[PDB]
Amino acid sequence: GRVIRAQRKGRGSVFRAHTHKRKGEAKLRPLDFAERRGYIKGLVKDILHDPGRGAPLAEVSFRDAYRYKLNKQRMVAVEGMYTGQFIYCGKNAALTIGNILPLNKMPEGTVVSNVEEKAGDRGTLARTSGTYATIVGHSDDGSKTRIRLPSGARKTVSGYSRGMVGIVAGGGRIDKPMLKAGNAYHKYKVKRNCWPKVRGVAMNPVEHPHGGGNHQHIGHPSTVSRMAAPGQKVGLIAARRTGLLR
């Protein structure tokens, strides 16, 4: 018996995300008339450290098309982007860093960040610091487009989907070692409580499938099926291959 801390994480409660001083969900500007029949001049007013992520957020000030008021979207900041810079969102904007073109306008070989999976998605792919999705090639029409993701994989995507030209800022922030436990602690405090992880072998055979025994060993295969239930699925899940790569 007893439920494993793998299983307790879905329950919510104490494993929820620490969202409080985070400064708004980062997105592209919601698909307008203006963006898809021409373009709309943004102005970058601020650049902000959002806590619990590597990327900066640019805060951008568009004029509203219909009312007198002045709107404000917060993007994930492509690097080479400064306070005072005009961004130009839309279909008929130039291919330069900052700007938010649809993917069919971008000529292949282009580096793109913060890309929309669907049309009007607001921007899902390649948002983490340093990353980008490169364009491979178009359709005959310009309807659909190939992209290569930060993983490796190759994704067909609608051409009327859009993203920012250039690489996301905060590039290469894993090349340092955190020397201290303290520096790990300050990292995961402003995210969820996922730290410190206890090894399941140290636990008793109640609390985990590995734990127990007069020597500190696992005792059955660490590799486990996709078909196994909640609370079996620990260790190496559905693994094609094990051991050191080459």
Place this chain on the structure above:
RNA sequence: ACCCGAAAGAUGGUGAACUAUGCCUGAGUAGAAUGAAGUCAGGGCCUGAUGGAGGUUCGUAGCGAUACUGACGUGCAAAUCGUUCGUCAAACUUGGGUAUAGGGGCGAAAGACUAAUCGAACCAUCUAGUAGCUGGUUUCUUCCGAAGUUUCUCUCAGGAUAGCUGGAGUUUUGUUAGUUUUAUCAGGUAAAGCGAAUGAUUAGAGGCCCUCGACCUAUUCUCAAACUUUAAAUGGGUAAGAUCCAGUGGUUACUUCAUUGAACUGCUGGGAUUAAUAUGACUCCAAGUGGGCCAUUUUUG
């Protein structure tokens, strides 16, 4: 269901005032030591200042609790007191608010903590839960008076079954017996046996040159729970007349070569206790008991 007694199970609720962890908003922590980058000068990268970094060191408050296996141990105290000791600007300490609840939580992981309750909290109920196991079980006299053995049993600390025992009814008195005698059988122990079989065993004799041998013939030493020709004592069986003996007729699908037999029956004779001694001899219902131990002789490891 004679009375009292579990470890547990389930149903429905109450708790984070202690503690575990997250979140929001507040507060807190002398004085020393060491002297990182950066900067300034002088000398040809060295020398001197400057500077004030660190999950750095010494050490207050605060958090903690190593040793004395000190004191105390019907305590001041259901965890305290003394001297000593760990850490002290951080993965730190801490108030209030808020989130997580019982096969659930929370866990820098000890099965820890979750109101002195934790290898599954607490409260009430199902519940007077079940117990082949412990402990108790309340007046007097009178009469009779056991068993620890048989078989079957997931049986070996229990049952069922028979026996031993009591009570309630009857049948009934030349019939009973843990005994001998008279006559007749069965038995293979004790002893005895090997110049009897079978098996074990010592000793010599007498049967082309030896030679111990061979084997044979008559003798000899000693033996046997799983060898025996022979064979006691003590025990065991049956019989000793009225539920008998004889003579004669009938019945019969049996039996015979045949009223020849066989068994059963009718009648007619013969006979009253036909060895000793003593002496009146079913049916029902039910209890307790099914751990036994000892002694003389026999006897197995």
Place this chain on the structure above:
RNA sequence: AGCAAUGAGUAGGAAGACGUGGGGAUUGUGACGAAGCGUUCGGCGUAAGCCUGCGUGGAACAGUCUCUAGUGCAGAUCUUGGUGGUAGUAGCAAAUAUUCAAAUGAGAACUUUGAAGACUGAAGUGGAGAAGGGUUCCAUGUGAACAGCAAUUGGACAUGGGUUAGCCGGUCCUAAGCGACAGCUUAACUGCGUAUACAGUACCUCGUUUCGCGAAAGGGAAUCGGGUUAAUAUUCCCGAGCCAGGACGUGGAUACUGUACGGUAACGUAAGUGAACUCCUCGACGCAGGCAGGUGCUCCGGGAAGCGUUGUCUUUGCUUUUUAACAGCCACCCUGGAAUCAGUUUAGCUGGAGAUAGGGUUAGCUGGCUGGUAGAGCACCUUGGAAGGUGUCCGGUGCGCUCCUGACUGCCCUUGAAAAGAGGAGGGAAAGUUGUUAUUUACACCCCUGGCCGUACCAAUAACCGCAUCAGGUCUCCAAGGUUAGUAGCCUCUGGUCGAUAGAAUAAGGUAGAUAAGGGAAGUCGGCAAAAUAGAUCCGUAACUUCGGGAAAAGGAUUGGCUCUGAGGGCUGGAACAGCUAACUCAGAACUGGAGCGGACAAGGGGAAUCCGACUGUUUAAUUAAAACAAAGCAUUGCGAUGGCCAUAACUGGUGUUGACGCAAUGUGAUUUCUGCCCAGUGCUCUGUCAAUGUGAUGAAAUUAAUCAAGCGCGGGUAAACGGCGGGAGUAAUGACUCUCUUAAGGUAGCCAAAUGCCUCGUCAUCUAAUUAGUGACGCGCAUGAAUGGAUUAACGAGAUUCCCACUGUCCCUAUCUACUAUCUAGCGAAACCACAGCCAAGGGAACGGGCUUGGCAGAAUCAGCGGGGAAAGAAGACCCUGUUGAGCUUGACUCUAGUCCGACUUUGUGAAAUUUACUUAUUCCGUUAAGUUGAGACUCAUGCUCUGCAUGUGUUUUGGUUUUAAGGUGGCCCGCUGAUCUACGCGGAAGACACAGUCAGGUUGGGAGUUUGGCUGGGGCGGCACAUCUGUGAAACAAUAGCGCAGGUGUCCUAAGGCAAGCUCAAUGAGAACAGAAAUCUCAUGUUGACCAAAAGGGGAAAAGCUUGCUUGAUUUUGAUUUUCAGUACGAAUACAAACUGUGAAAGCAUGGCCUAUCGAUCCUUUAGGUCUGAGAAACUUUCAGCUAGAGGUGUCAGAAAAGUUACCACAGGGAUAACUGGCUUGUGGCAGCCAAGCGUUCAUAGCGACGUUGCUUUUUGAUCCUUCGAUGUCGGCUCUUCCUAUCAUUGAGACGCAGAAGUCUCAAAGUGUCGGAUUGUUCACCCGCCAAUAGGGAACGUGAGCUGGGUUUAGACCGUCGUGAGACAGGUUAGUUUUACCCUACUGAUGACUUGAUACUGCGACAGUAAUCCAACUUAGUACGAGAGGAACAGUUGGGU
């Protein structure tokens, strides 16, 4: 009534009586005394019981026959209540402390007041709040009880009284979060809940957020001084203000063809309009560091008051000298143009994107001056018996302490809330025509109102929580002087307190605290405890190293007081001078002292190595702080959102305000250095078997071949997945090398008697006088080894080991001193425990008696101690076994199951083609403030072709501006349309008849549930089957008869090895026959069974029961009886007939399987055989079904459940029916002593020995056993302390010798005296170094835990190795882990003490008990005796030493 015989009794049965509460019937008693109770007034009955005198009592009760029951107590660790002994006992001992007088009172160690003396010692025991408490606050009064002595006192008791707000808080806002709306789930209970139609009577034009709760520490309108009450105050009063809302009035500003002016500017002043809408600011924010300035505090000096000291000195020491909120006034611009760069901080920074400089503007604090304001407050003086006065002044100082501000510098894979509310700006909507106007409601003054609730007190060594007035715990603020680096320690001022039962003595033993000559760990498991070191300055500092460290390494010297000298600033008037003057900081010298001086306080012991973990960090609240957890680094795994992992009954959520430099799931554990081989096993993963449905055939119909998903098979990959990694001979003592059997691969690099090596205290060095320890090597390593990570490693450690120096009372070896105790008194005053009690020896006994038997004995009553006994107390043994008792955990146990994968059907419609791919409306997903979609059209320029063309086509992109309440054009008499195109009401996309969902079907599913995990048993377990069953023996001559006794056997075999008849004779021996023998085949003679009969062993058998041939199937059918086990049940096996039908033989007969004794199976269920059979209950026919009778399918635990582990995290009921200790019986084994005489002993059995044999003793070894103990006798060893035994090591006196002397060996009387210091190990033993006269062996519950110790063993944490798939296991190793109570009785040791032919006093006697001395050496005797020589004694005497 008579006669005779008889009379024990637990468990148990039956019979007759006695007694109790009520009902029915009947006979009665009683206020002249009922019931009950007490009693030496008594009586009766075998007894249960009954009757009754006397006393008390005051109202109901009894006898007899019946009916009825909540009907009889010594026990239940029974229940409730009451009461003892223990006992006037344990005890009231922390927090330094009280004393004297007077007053009050019945009464004073304890109340109050004074005087002294102490403590607290501003991170206070002080002054204020919160939580919690709830009247404890204040006054007056008091009989109890309470305040562990007292009490006149009180937080007790009683009767009264007390809490005043626009400004102090709540109230208002929103945070983490939480309730509800729309709906959505569910039978509801619940659970989810950001979805929705939520200003200018009438006319327009706007319109995206839903209501509320959530902070007495976050945000926020405004308050301060003095006085006042027995108890309240920023709340009352006096005075001085401020804020929110709303406002009259008089007098000023400004405008009147339209909202003030000034300055070059930064910006300014008494005023100086600003609607909709929009943007901005404040509210609004981290930590560390130093620097500067300020408040308050502390400090030094002068002046004026009062006070203190005065034998002596002292222009002296101390206290007071204060000023509130509120109100007024005291970075940026211009000129200019920088290199010979300049300005500037403690630190760095700043500057042609305009520095220095000169002149301005602005921000500010808790700064200065005046008002407030001296009238108040404070300190004094004089008249009244409360009136009136003077004074309150003027300056310094600082790395000082406190809090605040300011600008800087640094740190982060950490970047440090929101909303209410207040204001600004852009915008220009409105109004206003020189007067009742109109903007000013904060232009100045004036006027009015401010609700509701909290408000006392404690906030802790007595108001809270711990059952309590409990040495415990519980958030915040302020924080003085001296010493010092210092909020350290030590002493003090303000404020607070003396509350903690006292007095007397000063025994042992305690508790804490001191000190010890000589030696210096010899003590001990172990340096445990305690010592020693310690501050500052100057000098000096290694191995090793990740170059940062190690380092305060190690190792040295100095320090006090007093008198001097030198160096280090600031402000004034213009070569540097002249005046005035202020810090505590360094350096050095002289002198002086009992050589002291960080003088008290405070304050590291050090060094050399090994093991583990890198480090800081964390942990088992109340036995485990570590080597365990974590950690950074390293590596693997899954996942591109219709997704990965996870929650949910459902709806739907978490990760996710997320997107691979990410989230999720694992394993290793910094750095350095490496991570070898194995894919057969078990997992994981990659591309024949065969369910439901549906289809087709058969038959009257129910029923009864193809097709056939996933999975499993088949075929690959994968070890930083679980894991695994060999033997044997020969060969130059050794085996480079050759051969051989075998695995998926055969342990590679490394490392080792390891925290891992059984043998093992391994072997060789080293440390030691001596080492089961430590270190360094050596490896056939029981059982090392590579991210189950291998080998290292600086720094670090309340970690585990060893050695050295220093230092010590740990030790030799104990001794003294201090306080509080114990002790004695006054007052107060428990509890555990208690069958009855308390002197021993032996005996027997349930095998270690306080009681019993036989002895020794035995004299009141008491006090202080002590730990031998009471198998003392504390707990229904936690070890072990039993139970058809559990629970936690595991899995390849049995039965399932959430989840998931897969197929079918519904959802499910419309098309097309020969299963594929078109449609869109079901259904699904995403986005938007549902704003611009579909198809046509022109507006501008533009690549440019022809002015008008199809179009391909674009138009804001040059700068951190602005874009809102449209202008224009044009029509209605002041309001419209166009500008701003028509189109069709599809908000815009993505997917789409597939997903999803519902119901069935199949696979997977310790994630989870429920359950099980035999018995016998010289304890259980392992082993075995004694669990069904046969033979022989045990077995004691009928029968019966046990053990885990003995020797063996069975789960079959066979159409013949069954049946019958006939013929024949077998094993073996003897003598014979070409090839031929020891064995072939043939022949005669002899052959009592010596062969053979399917198999164990035993019976039985010769014209057979054996062998060979012939013919056959009785090994058939129908059911009963009997025998065997036995209950006289069943099964099985067998026997004897009956009624059939066959076989063989001439026939008699024989044959119902084997010549006889073993060779096997209920109910239920299934299955087949039999009948013209019975039933399916409305009636026929006819499939299927149910029956009746007889076989088979099987339970071997064999009279017949369907079944794996583990628990050291454990639990319950029990068990001495049953193990691990002592004790008891036994004595194989161990130990000790005899008897015989073969030989040894030059010769000689016996001086001394003693083979082959043989007889005893012992309970100091170890077994064997299970009697005692499981509602507990505290399981090793050491220390301490006593006594006993003799089987004598030494000492005394002898005897014998292969005894010359010396030295010995053997034996007798002998237990009087003695038997030691150390190294290693937990040791008991052992083995060494040494001494000595000698270092003998044993017992006393394997003496000795309310005597200690806790090293070992034997709980819970953790590590290694081997075993196990795992949880876990180990008589394998390793480290960390609570040792409770005496005050009872006796015993022992000490203390008083009643009484006896009187009192009292002194001197004595000595029954009896206990005993104490014992060893060695030197000098002479003596270089003598004796001896061939070497060597070499003794007694008496003398002198010392040990214990």
